[PDB]
Each structure stands twice: as structure tokens, then as C-alpha cells.
Amino acid sequence: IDDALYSRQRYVLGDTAMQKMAKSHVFLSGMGGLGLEIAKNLVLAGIKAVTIHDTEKCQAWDLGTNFFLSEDDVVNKRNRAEAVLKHIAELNPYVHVTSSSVPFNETTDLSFLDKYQCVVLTEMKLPLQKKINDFCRSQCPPIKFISADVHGIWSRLFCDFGDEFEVLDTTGEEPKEIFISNITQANPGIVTCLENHPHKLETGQFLTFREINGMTGLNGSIQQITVISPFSFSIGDTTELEPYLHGGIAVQVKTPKTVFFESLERQLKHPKCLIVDFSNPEAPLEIHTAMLALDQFQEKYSRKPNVGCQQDSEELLKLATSISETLEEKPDVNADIVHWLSWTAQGFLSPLAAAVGGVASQEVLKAVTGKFSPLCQWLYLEAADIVESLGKPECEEFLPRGDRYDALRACIGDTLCQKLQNLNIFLVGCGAIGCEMLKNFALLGVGTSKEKGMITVTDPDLIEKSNLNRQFLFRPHHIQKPKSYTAADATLKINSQIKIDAHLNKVCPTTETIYNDEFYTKQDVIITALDNVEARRYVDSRCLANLRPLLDSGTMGTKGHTEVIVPHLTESYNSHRDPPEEEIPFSTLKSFPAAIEHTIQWARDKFESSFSHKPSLFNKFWQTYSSAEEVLQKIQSGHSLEGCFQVIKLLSRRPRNWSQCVELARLKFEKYFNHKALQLLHCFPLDIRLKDGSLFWQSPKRPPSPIKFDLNEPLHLSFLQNAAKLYATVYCIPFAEEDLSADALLNILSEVKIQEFKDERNAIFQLEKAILSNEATKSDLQMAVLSFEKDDDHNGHIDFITAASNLRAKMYSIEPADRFKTKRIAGKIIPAIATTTATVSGLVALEMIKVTGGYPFEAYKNCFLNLAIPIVVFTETTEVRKTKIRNGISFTIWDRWTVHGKEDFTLLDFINAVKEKYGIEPTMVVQGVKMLYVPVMPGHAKRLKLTMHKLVKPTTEKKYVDLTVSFAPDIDGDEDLPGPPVRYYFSH
């Protein structure tokens, strides 16, 4: 497993899942849009062998749904499967891809399918799906079966993994760790958790214990729990065991789970659907009824319903009514859903196809690996809200016209399509989500109008090797190139009429000059694909000042969320100020570690302090003062200096050659992993007790122990080598790779002794000694500065950090960690995968249509999903909140007051103007973080007689500034009432 390509995916799937992914063959049938999306996601995932199969030929109608075909392919009438074969293999050279075109029918021999292990069907008639599903589930072992289809704005997903399926990880969350406080010799026994820190457990789970004093019988055993209180639970009889002394650690144990499925034919009479919107829990049954009626109609008449022909709608409604009474549950018939399905039967919506494809790819991964809990047993996604607000459009608006947008026009109508081609949309960040959004834009024809339309994408980063796993628009020969330019070039190939303007800037306050308010006013919607909260907050504040809709999304592993912000209707991003996160206490990180995270963090901080901060201080100090003799003279005159002791100590211990570097590394190792333990034990002996008598070295504290150096231990050798290399680099001492051999290290260390374990004059003496030794040359006052680079496999950073963390952990008798986990923790790498990004991109693309159409408040939705469970939740966006201050005056977050002044305007004039215009008098004026008028602090009383122009010191380009004000509360002693921001104009 080349980690340089699958670094992000391993943290989600796991090594065993990766191994099972190889040696797997997947058969995929039907090369429409949905099949193409599924194939792309699977190939990016890393399946060994994928076979695509199709029998039709390319048509001009296909150009609106397939983002790999071309005009030439349509001209040559190539088979659809072959025309995409070459491009798909370009995504991943490690994947073997083959195409097939054997016809499918009732008399086709299905014997050849047994070679594969998972079958995906798309654009297939129902009876053949029934036959295939019956055949597959009867194999030994059974072959997994998945079906999916998209018609208009409705989708259907189905799964079947045989009679019995086994899951090796129900949820995928890492088990937590708890500390036992007290045990009871009772039947059943009672276990009390430590003070605070609720166990957060539930009855029926299984735990195992270790490191228990007295009750040695429970160490290494497995018990099933019963929650009694948030801080305690129950375990079986313990009356036959010794009394509990102290200590004890329990960790959760995962247990395999078995699920059951049914045949497709059986499931058609009472499906076990999945609820995605709790406002209408009965919707999936009605959607299922309508889809079944549509399939029956298509079988009977050998064609799909024509739009606007009311007799087809009546026939479909009658069929749906006939089917509904046959269902076991006997639901009702939704006339509206049937009507709309009849209306747009021949359409195809790209973002819905993308979302369904992402979900289906995740399902296939679950089927092949058994990593997570599978879907059971249906899923019905739809986007009815898009056409719910159209009222009663005419049929002529949906007729095809003979271009690449026929599918979309049949979906939503001509007017909305035209309003789409004139969008000016500003996109921030070009990460994984950005590429999918660009693909969706190209498919929808966003901004393709000649007169108006432009897409702006800005990103300062460069293409990296690990980025090729998730972003499909990049190629191996695109490494070390701007993301924006490569993305623009890739997108222009999909659609020739797309007009894209690309930049390289990073959205930040410093670059605000180019992204002035006129630029934001020109835009019509802002979409964010960032990865940090500060940029999100800054962009949200910028958009709030110009009344522009904002769409935000983000993913993490198998979880993702979407948020929609509309002016004058919903709350902003900053209205959701989130809670903070626990930070390791200073004393747990420094002297009393308790988990591998603490040691990793300590190693990271030690690396930073030793190789970044100290070199910077050294260089700054020695550039402040020209000569060392001057520094010595100033010291001898009693003049104080900043940090003089530290820099002089660094100067005294400067290495000169390779041997000195090795000796320095050895001394650092000894000081770090030998003397600290002895010092800590000397200060606190093992038997010291507190006031209540409990031992000080109790949980969660762990006693340390010294480690003796030994060159034969591989960990010791690795740490020594990495430290030597880093110090040689920092002090700029040349070295060769042969000097890193074990034998050379043995030879150098053969004559190095170790000191046993137990100011101004000394510093002056050492400085004078350095001076008389001609060690104070200009070259000597120079030290290279290193920076953390987790993606480099030869700088030795990760090796050093891992070795140090493992050594410190073994000092405190804690389980060590491997290289990959250490890298993930130190670099704070966010795990990611393609399916979730594709799904959230599809959902954002759906919401953009509603934003463009100017639909009322009820149409917008927010989605939170977790594919691991799986679970999808749709909620209405948070409503705007009224806030009042006094006298019945109220304001929202979107309000903003204005004051017009002139050249001779004074602060008192401003106060009086606000008081007259809005009715209340402010008591404090602050420009951003720089204050202007605070009565409490001295000297501001006289500020009332100053020109505003002097007091603001503005820039000539800006004709106005924004201020924040507050008002005196009605009752004294209370915090001042906040007010809406006020914009001040210098002149008319």
C-alpha cells in the first residue's frame, strides 16, 4: 500500500479493509450518468478489477449527462462503454478496467456472473432485475446485489446482501477509555466511575479490564454491563473475589453483528424504507407506489409518459390506485406526486444523480469490505421542492429544443435554465469539493451566456501527490502547478462555452483591497469550500455586509453537513457560535502523561522549541548587535540584555563537526529519557501520601522509570540517527550517508562519557573564551531555521517525532504507536473520502437552484448526514430573530444605519444626528478594534470637539467607514444594549 496515494483513505477504512478491497471484482451495467458516477467513485476508491458493460450507442442527448463523451464520439456512433474506457483508466493506473457488450435478456445465461463479487444494475427493466436478484442470492457464497435508477427528479436505491450478512464494525468509532474509582464485592457488583467524566455507556455493551489492584480476577476478563447512573453501572457477581484496592482501566470491546435481508420480489409488497424527512414520514411509501406504477406503465405501453398529455396522467393515476390497495399496509395515493412524476418522466437531473452515485459507491464499499453497517433496505431521495414553487407552468416551456441542455430543460423548464446561464458566482477554495462543484457547473451550463456570466475561483495552494486520490480533475503530470489554473483547464474541456476567471490569491483581510465591496455587489452567490473556521467566519462577515446569499459545506470522514444563508430570511454563520474543545492541562502534558496523545504532543512541542524558536531568537539577537566584543563590553558595563543567557549558552555548546553532533544527540537522549525520571522520583517518592491517605501516584498519574541506552535496540538507533541529522542540518555541518551506519555510530560513541545525575561570571568567562578562540566570526552567528513538513519522507521529521514519542511512552509504561497514527495526530490530518464529497457537492448544487429561483423561506433545507450508520436528516433553516433595545425599536442582523456628514462634521454632531434620526443616543463609538470615544477612560472628554475626518484617519479610496455603537441600559449596573452597525459617509 503506497501511502503517498492512500494516506487519507486509510484513516477512514483501515488496513484490513484495504486488504479486502484488493482481490475483488465488481460488475457494473448501464453507462448513463449514474453508472458513470458510480464507476468514477469506485475507481478512485482503489478496487482491483472493474468491468463496465453497455449495449447502446452514443446520442446527442447523452452529451447533457456524460462528462467524458465528445462530439466526435457522437459522430462515429461508438459504443458508450468503449468511448469512456480510456479516460476512466486515467484516473488510477493501479486499477484494471475492462469493457463488455454481451446482450442481456431473459434467455441470457447468467453463469458467468459467479466470477464477480458484487453486481450493480442501472437502467434495467424490472423483470430481468427480479431474475438476476433471484439468481445471485442463491449462490454459495451469495453475490451482493445493488440496483439504482433516476427518473426526472426522483431516485430509487435498493440493496440485498443475501439471507445473512456479517458486519465486523457496527459504527466505526474508536472505543473510549474510562477509569474505575470503586468496586463492590456484591451480587451483582457495582462499579463507580471516577469523579466527573461520565462513562457515556449503554446497557448491553461489553468491557474488558486491566491493571486492577486486589481484584486480580477481573484483569483480562470480559463482562456485559448494565447502566445504573451516568457515573456507574453493574457487573456480575464478585462476592468471591478479593476486596478492591485502587486503580483499574476498562475499554469497550467491539462485537460482530448479523443482519438479515430479503429477496427483491418479496420486498416489493412492503418495503422497509428509510426516513429522511420526519415532517412527512409517510412520503417514502407513496413514492414507492408511484415508481412501481410508472414501471408497470412502461412495461405495458413500451414507452414513457409524454409531458402534458393528461390521458397519460389519468392512466398512471389509475394504475397507482390499483397498486396501492394491493400493498400490505394499504396507504393513500398522493395525486400531486403522481402528477409531477408524469410531468417530468423523461428528464434527468445531474446533482441528484451525483448524490445517489456517492451513496451507491459507499454501499458497494460496505458490501465488499464489511466495514460498516449496510443500508436496509430502500432509499428514496427526491427534489420535489424545486418544482413545488413553479405553480402551474405551461407544457411548451418543457419541450426539447435540440441542444445539450434538453435533459435539464425537460427537468425544470426553460425560464429557470435561462436564469441559470446568467449567473455570476464567486467560489472560494478549490479542494475536493471545488472540483465536484466545477463539474456540476459545467454540466448545468452555469454562466455560459455570451452577454453575462462569469465564475471566479481563487486558491493559493499547489497540486500535491496525495491530492490525486480525491480530486479527479488533476493528473500525475500536474504536480507542482496551481490548482486554479489546472481546474480551469480541465473544466474548459467538459464544456467549451464555459467562461472561467481564475486567480491565485488567498481570501484574507490583507487582500481585501482587490475584493472590495463593488466586487461582492457584482456577484450573485458565494460558495465556500474551505477547511478552517476562521476563513469561513471572515467570508461570512464579508457577505453579511453586502446582503449576498452564502452556501457553506464541510465533510469529515463519513460525516458531512450543508448550510444555506439567505438575506433577510435566515441567521448567519456567526449566529451559531460553537462550544470550545478541551485542551490538555499544562501539568498532564509536561510531567504526568496518561495517553499516547500526550506524548505525541510533547514530542511535537519539543521539536518546535528545539528547531524553530531557538534559531530565530539566535539570529535576531546576533543581528541586533553587530559584534560579540561589543556585547561583551556592554555586559561588563552592567548593561542588561534580553535573553542574553540563553543565546550565550547556545553559543558555548556549538558543535563543530559530525562527532560533536553525535555526542550532542547522545547527551540530549540521556537528559530527556534518564534524568527526568530520577528527578521526578526524587521530588516525589513512590510511597508519598496525600492528606486523606491515598497514594499520590494513583490514577490517572503513572509512575515513571529510567531507560538505559542500548545501541542494539532499533528504536534507540532510529532516535539517535534522526537527532544527529537534524542537529547537523541546523548547525550547517556537512555529512554523508555512510556516517549513519551502525558501526560508525559505535566507533564514535566508544570514547564519549556520560555525566552522572544530581551565572553572569560564567557567561562572561565563556564568551571571553569564545572570543579569544576566534569562534565569533560572522559565519558563526548564523543558524538555519527548520519548518515542519509532514509530507516529506526524507527530512526525517516524522521519524524523529515518532521515536521520541515511543521512547517517552515506554518510560511511563504506555502502549506505543506506529508511524501512521503518529503522523495523523501530529499533523492533525483530517480523514476524507470521495463518496461524501460527491454527495455534499450534489446537495449544494441542488440548493443553488432554489437560491437562484428566489423561492420563499419554506423551500430551503439543511442536511446533516452520516453514511456510516447510515442516516440522513433534512431540517428547515433557522429563522431570523428579532432583537429589540428600547422604545419598541428592533433590528435584525441584516440591518445597517446610515449617517451623512461633511468636511467639518464633529463627533458631537454625529451623536446628535443619530439621536435625532433614530431616537436614542449612543454612549460609545468604536471602529473595529480601535476605539474612538469611551467616556470612562481619561482624555476622551475633550474628543467631542474634533473633526471626524481627523479622528477616523481613513484611506482616500473608501468614501465611508463602519462603526459599532452601544446604548445605555434602562437600569444602571447592566451591560450596555448592543446596536446595529452604523455606516458613516464623509460627504454627499
Binding site: 492541562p585 499544562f586 501539568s587 542588561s640 534580553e642 508519598i688 468604536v926 478594534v929 470612562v936 459599532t964
Partner: protein, 291 residues
């Protein structure tokens, strides 16, 4: 004397001083040493607005509620334009090893204040060579429950609704600078009253006394910070006789245990260092001009 001391100092508890100057390019030029330079320069975001309201409300309290007495007092300075920059000077209480010291702190307010507690850093560490207290690490980090955010206890955290800066200051002065700092460390209170504990406490007290005489009075007089220059000069000028008496008593008390064997060498070393410091401090005080 105490009445005059209270009367004179009461006009200097709160004021403003110029620390940051901005050029035409918007770059920030600091005229005094500040520990949080990088955070100030990087965090240029102007989204924060509730922080300004909270600080403006706090300025009402800080103008009048600061403790002020002969034993201890607090002095605060803030920038002439920005509101997230402050420097605090605290005089050590009486009858403690930190008696009549002058300790300087740096306070910075994050953007999301008051949702998060402010940052505090001790500056009178003597070049990181001295650990003044078990809660005051020699690197300058000051650790308190109220300034930390972790599991702990719900009433032992930075509560945005009730916690205030004045509480932080009073807590520091009342809990960090105490009579016997040696017993602040948990796990030593068990040995309280034992002869060994008393001997260890005496050794720790001697070390702290010599360290504070060195790095809290002499260095401050020779190289006062620009912000608190006048306060320092007026403070030391008014209490020279008491300072001399206290130093003489400290020198006398230390030698009482020089005949011991377990800690005799350390006590003798501390006494010699204290004598060497006091010899120069006497000359420095004799040359101080009248403010």
C-alpha cells in the same frame, strides 16, 4: 505614613500609555517589549464586536475597584488606541517572601473574548532562570483553574456570564503570593508540621527571598519599564526605610540555620547572595532622586 502612601498612589492606579504606532502601510510598530507580538500581528480580524462592549463595561469597574493599600496594590496600563493590550504591575503582600516586590504581567484578549479567558504571562522571571512559585513556571506561564479550559469542575472554569477580569487579578494576588509558597504544591501538605517539612520550607523561602531581592527591586530600579517608570520611582522612594529594615531582618534570620548540616551549605550560599545583593541595593536606594 500609610495614609500618605494611599493618597499619593490613588491617582496612578489606572491610566493609558502609547504602545503601538501605525505607519501609512498599516504595519504595527511596538515601542515596548510585549510577549504576544505574533498573535497581535496575525489576528487582524475586525469581526469581533461583543469584545469591545465587554471591555468598555469592564473599564468602568477597573477605574475604581482596584485593590489599594499599604500592604498590596495593583496598577493597570492600557494602549491609547487598541483595547486588547494591557500591562499589570502587582506589589507583593507583607509578611511573605515576596514582600514589597514589583512584578509585571502581560495580558492579551483573544478575538472571541469573553467566550474564552484572556491570556496572562509573567515577565519578571529574570531571564527564565527563576521559578518564583509552584504555580509560576520559570518560562513565564501562569496557571490557574479560572484561566484554563478543561474537564475539571463546572464551577472551576471560565464562565462567560459571571467571570470577570477583576476576579482574575484578585485571585492571582490572594492565592499565588501567600505566606508559605512551599506548601502550595499538592502532596507536600501531608508533611505539614514535620521538622523535615519545616526545613524544606525554610530552604525554599530563603531561595525565594534572595531571588526577589535580586530580580524584583534592583533590576526594576536600574531598568524600569517605560510604562510604569513613575509608579516604580514613587513606590520605592516612599518605602526605603521599611525595605532596609526588612532586608536586615531577612539577612539575620537566614544565618540562624547556617550551623545545620543537612541544609547548611544552601543556607550559607543564600545568605552570601543576599548580602551581595543588599550591598548594591543600598547604594542604588541612596542615589534615588526625589520624584
Amino acid at each position: 505614613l500609610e495614609e500618605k502612601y494611599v493618597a499619593v498612589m490613588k491617582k496612578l492606579q489606572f491610566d493609558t500609555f502609547e504602545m503601538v504606532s501605525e505607519d501609512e502601510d498599516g504595519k504595527l510598530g511596538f515601542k515596548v517589549n510585549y510577549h504576544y507580538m505574533s498573535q497581535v500581528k496575525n489576528a487582524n480580524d475586525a469581526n469581533s464586536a461583543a469584545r469591545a462592549r465587554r471591555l468598555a463595561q469592564e473599564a468602568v469597574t477597573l477605574s475604581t475597584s482596584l485593590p489599594l493599600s499599604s500592604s498590596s496594590s495593583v496598577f493597570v496600563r492600557c494602549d491609547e488606541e487598541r483595547l486588547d493590550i494591557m500591562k499589570v504591575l502587582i506589589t507583593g503582600p507583607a509578611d511573605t517572601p515576596y514582600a514589597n516586590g514589583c512584578f509585571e504581567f502581560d495580558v492579551y484578549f483573544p478575538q472571541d473574548y469573553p467566550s474564552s479567558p484572556p491570556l496572562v504571562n509573567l515577565e519578571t522571571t529574570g531571564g527564565h532562570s527563576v521559578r518564583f512559585n509552584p504555580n509560576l513556571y520559570n518560562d513565564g506561564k501562569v496557571c490557574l483553574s479560572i484561566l484554563n479550559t478543561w474537564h475539571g469542575r463546572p464551577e472551576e472554569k471560565w464562565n462567560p456570564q459571571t467571570s470577570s477580569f477583576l476576579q482574575v487579578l484578585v485571585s492571582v494576588q490572594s492565592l499565588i503570593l501567600v505566606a508559605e509558597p512551599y506548601f502550595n504544591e499538592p502532596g507536600y501538605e501531608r508533611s505539614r508540621g514535620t521538622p523535615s517539612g519545616t526545613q524544606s520550607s525554610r530552604e525554599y523561602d530563603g531561595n525565594i527571598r534572595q531571588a526577589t531581592v535580586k530580580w524584583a527591586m534592583l533590576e526594576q530600579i536600574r531598568n524600569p519599564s517605560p510604562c510604569f517608570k513613575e509608579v516604580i520611582h514613587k513606590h520605592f522612594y516612599l518605602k526605603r526605610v521599611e525595605i532596609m529594615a526588612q532586608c536586615e531582618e531577612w539577612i539575620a534570620d537566614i544565618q540562624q540555620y547556617s550551623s545545620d548540616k543537612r541544609v547548611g551549605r544552601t543556607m550559607s550560599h543564600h545568605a552570601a547572595a543576599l548580602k551581595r545583593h543588599t550591598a548594591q541595593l543600598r547604594e542604588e536606594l541612596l542615589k534615588l532622586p526625589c520624584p
